Nucleic acid binder design. Structure first.
Length: 185
RNA sequence: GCGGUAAUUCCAGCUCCAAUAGCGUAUAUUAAAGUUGUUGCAGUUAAAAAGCUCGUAGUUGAACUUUGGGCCCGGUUGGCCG
């Protein structure tokens, strides 16, 4: 049973469909299976897109992100292909530890890898996964609101030019901040 | 500052001003005085930047690390519709 095997937890129908897709990809087999057998995800989050589609957020343990990062292209192509009406993307379950206060207090202090801002920055880096961000800008709007511009490279934006709003909605839903992307020319 | 022959200031007389049963004088002090400066001084030339540099105390010193209630308010994007 490489179905509930490859997550590493029982639920649920979405993740199981995904796992059986993984399995059907593994059955390719040779080059795909070779690096797709160790790569397991943990959970999935299906959420809205401003258009019609939904968006798959595939959560990961983050020692697997390397092999996941080697592929991403073929998993996003095949999963978007099979599970249509969707925008697929993988992400890493990064633990956020709370900020030390006088009430709450923790030994094994709190490295900056585990802080919130870093985790949020990395989430963006994985949403894009390709296309090394050229810049970030943050407008602070007079209505006390905040928006982040993320400046992308023109290379390989064709692969994700149809996912921007989904990424925006995702980051807004998880992190709570508004978002926009941009490519200089 | 007045005053050396016809003194608007001296000495008297007259007239008048202020304060008033209190007034003046002298000294010390106070704000005035941002003329001792934390607020708040100054330093080309008016008094004052060490001949210049290092340097201990001293003074000072880049940026960075997630939030419980509820109500109202209005923005700014998003869709859903145009």
């Amino acid at each position: 049973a490489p179905q509930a095997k490859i997550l590493s937890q029982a639920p649920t129908e979405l993740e199981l469909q995904v796992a059986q897709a993984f399995v059907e990809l593994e059955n390719s087999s040779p080059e795909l299976k070779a690096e797709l057998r160790p790569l397991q995800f943990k959970s999935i989050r299906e959420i809205d897109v401003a258009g019609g589609k939904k968006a798959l957020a595939i959560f990961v343990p983050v020692p697997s992100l390397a092999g996941f990062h080697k592929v991403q292209t073929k998993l996003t192509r095949e999963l978007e292909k099979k599970f249509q009406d969707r925008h697929v993307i993988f992400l890493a379950e990064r633990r956020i530890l709370p900020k030390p206060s006088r009430t709450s207090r923790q030994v094994q202090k709190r490295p900056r890898s585990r802080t919130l801002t870093a985790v949020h920055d990395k989430i963006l880096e994985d949403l894009v996964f390709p296309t090394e961000i050229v810049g970030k800008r943050v407008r602070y709007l007079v209505g006390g609101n905040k928006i982040q511009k993320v400046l992308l490279d023109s290379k390989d934006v064709q692969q994700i030019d149809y996912k921007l709003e989904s990424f925006q909605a995702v980051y807004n839903k998880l992190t709570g901040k508004q978002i926009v992307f941009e490519i200089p020319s």
